[PDB]
Structure formats: structure tokens, C-alpha cells
Ligand binder design. Structure first.
Ligand code: AGS
Lengths: 235, 72
């Protein structure tokens, strides 16, 4: 898979096919060495961080912000949250064909699932991130009277990858609950009815997860039954 | 005890070419690594991307293809 949506789809299908029919500890020391060499806490300048090391801290098994209560890790996740939010205008402004574009998106997906990996301590960051995402998507979709037109910013920058975060938020059973705690599914339900933007329905119909029964199949059925004819054909 | 860093760098440069073909060797080397408290940062990055998935296209890739695509 060349793309990152089809990659997540095939990985989720392989994961559920493996899950239907049935590592190092590094407590506090090596974690501190890895977050020291990661260069996130030394300086706030973006694009100079060591993103391989960030991916290795976020994808290590037993570090999940629930068993290692250290203030440096909270500083690290707060800096990554402020970088990844679209309101701060840092990640959502880098254009396509970038030198490191797929890596930042992969790190973002594993970061927003790492936040969900602590279901009792990872609310204050995840709720803020998904509220900022739905705020940006309501601002760009046309639910506001300011401009109702930002197709020139979604189509050529990395800010179109914020559906993939919702995609990797939609697979887990605790993910749909957090996604419905904010007004995300209703926002896509109102997005289904508009007539001017057809690319957003292509983005949301190829990102969500339809493995289990819920509100994700209702959006797919609403696009399939009542939508634009081109979007209906693509669905 | 003195050839640890050079052998770990050689091991990291070797397992960068091997994709999921090295996943069978990880519990064999992990005993020797935790026995003498050997920590290498690039090897940790590589085995973190090997055990837990990074993407699907980069794992199990011809290394000459990568060297050609990075030379350009
Ligand atoms: N480009 C940036 N990347 C990360 N953080 C930034 C960036 N630019 C400004 N910041 C600020 O850094 C804040 C997060 O830092 P904290 O998690 O509070 O760690 P900190 O070291 O206490 O920060 P300060 O500035 O010393 S209070 C962001 O919410 C912003 O206030």
C-alpha cells in the first residue's frame, strides 16, 4: 500500500483476523535517556526534533503515561499536543511533497492512540485534540459564516490527514466512546448533506472503521442513500 | 566488554537491511543484551519498528532499492 488510509485498513483487517483466533521493561532510566536525546524538551523549534526517537518512545510497549508518572513525560506530551493541534497552525500548514511528510503522520497516529492507551489519565489531552479537530473541520466545512471556503488549504497541505487520526481513533472500542463524547459523528452526519465539497466525503468514507455495529455504519448508509451523485458513486 | 559499541553498530547496520526476517532472532539476542545491560539507541529504534509496526511498505524491503532511492 502506497497510501496511509489503505495501509491502516489492511492493518486493521489483519489485526482483527489475528485477534479473532488466538520486549523490554525499561522502567525509568532508559526512558529518561531516550526522552533526553529526543531533543523535544531542550528546544521548542520544530523540524529539528529526532522523530525516530519520538516514534520509539511512543511505540514502546509499557510506557503509556499511566504507570510512569513523571513531569518530563507530561511536558513531552504537552509539547507534542501543541505541535499537532491545528489551531496552533504548526502541523496543519506544512504542504504536500514534503521531505518528511509520511513520518509525521505515522507519528501522529501512534501518538493519538498512545494517548488512548491510558484510558483514565489520557483524557485532558485527547479531548482537547479532538475538540480542536472538530472545530477546524466545522470551520473548513462551511458551518460558519466567515468564509465557508478553505478547499485551497486542505487539498495541498498535511491538514487533510486529520481524518486519519479519527481513523486510528475509530478502531478501538474505547475510541468510539471518546469520539462520541465530542460532537464528531453528528458533525460528519451534517457534513454528508452539503453539495459544494465532495473531497471531504471521500476523506471521511475511507478513514472510518466499519468493523462493529454503531454510528459509523449510519454515516456510510447516509452517504450511500442521500448524497451527491459522484460521492454516492464513490461510496 | 570493549567491543560492545562497534558490534552493536554493526548489528544495527545489519538489521536495518533485514525487515521482519530478524524478528525470529530478537529473543536470542535479548538475553545477551539484558545480561550485560547493553543499551543501543539505534538498535532500540529498529527493533521497536520491527516488533510494533511502522508501516507496511517499508518492512521487508530490498536494501539496494533503498540505497538507490536515497542516492537520488
Ligand atoms: N512550537 C512549539 N512547540 C511546542 N511548544 C510550543 C511551541 N511554541 C510555543 N510553545 C509553547 O510551549 C507550551 C508547552 O510547553 P509546556 O508543556 O508548558 O512545557 P514548559 O517547559 O513548562 O513550557 P514553558 O514555556 O517553560 S511554561 C506550548 O503550549 C506553548 O505555550
Amino acid at each position: 500500500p502506497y497510501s496511509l488510509h489503505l495501509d491502516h485498513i489492511i492493518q486493521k483487517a489483519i489485526a482483527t483476523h489475528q485477534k479473532r483466533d488466538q520486549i523490554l521493561k525499561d522502567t525509568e532510566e532508559a526512558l529518561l535517556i531516550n526522552l533526553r536525546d529526543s531533543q523535544v524538551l531542550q528546544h521548542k523549534e520544530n523540524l529539528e526534533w529526532n522523530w525516530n526517537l519520538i516514534g520509539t518512545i511512543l511505540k514502546w510497549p509499557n510506557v503509556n503515561l499511566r504507570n510512569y508518572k513523571d513531569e518530563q513525560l507530561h511536558r513531552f506530551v504537552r509539547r507534542l499536543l501543541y505541535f499537532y493541534k491545528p489551531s496552533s497552525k504548526l502541523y496543519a500548514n506544512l504542504d504536500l511533497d514534503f521531505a518528511k511528510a509520511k513520518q509525521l503522520t505515522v507519528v501522529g497516529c501512534q501518538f493519538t492512540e498512545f494517548l488512548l492507551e491510558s484510558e483514565e489519565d489520557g483524557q485532558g489531552y485527547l479531548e482537547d485534540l479532538v475538540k480542536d479537530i472538530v472545530q477546524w473541520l466545522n470551520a473548513s466545512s462551511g458551518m460558519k459564516p466567515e468564509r465557508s471556503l478553505q478547499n485551497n488549504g486542505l487539498l495541498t497541505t498535511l491538514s487533510q490527514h486529520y481524518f486519519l487520526f479519527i481513523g486510528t481513533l475509530s478502531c478501538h472500542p474505547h475510541g468510539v466512546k471518546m469520539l462520541e463524547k465530542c460532537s464528531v459523528f453528528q458533525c460528519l452526519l451534517n457534513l454528508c448533506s452539503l453539495k459544494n465539497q465532495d473531497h471531504l466525503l471521500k476523506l471521511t468514507v475511507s478513514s472510518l472503521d466499519y468493523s462493529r455495529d454503531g454510528l459509523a455504519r449510519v454515516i456510510l448508509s447516509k452517504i450511500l442513500t442521500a448524497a451527491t451523485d459522484a460521492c454516492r458513486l464513490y461510496a | 566488554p570493549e567491543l560492545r559499541s562497534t558490534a552493536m553498530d554493526t548489528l544495527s547496520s545489519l538489521v536495518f537491511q533485514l525487515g521482519k526476517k530478524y524478528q525470529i532472532f530478537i529473543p536470542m539476542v535479548n538475553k545477551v543484551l539484558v545480561r550485560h545491560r547493553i543499551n543501543h539507541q539505534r538498535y532500540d529504534v529498529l527493533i521497536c519498528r520491527i516488533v510494533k509496526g511502522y508501516t507496511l511498505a517499508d518492512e521487508e524491503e530490498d536494501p539496494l532499492i533503498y540505497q538507490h532511492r536515497m542516492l537520488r
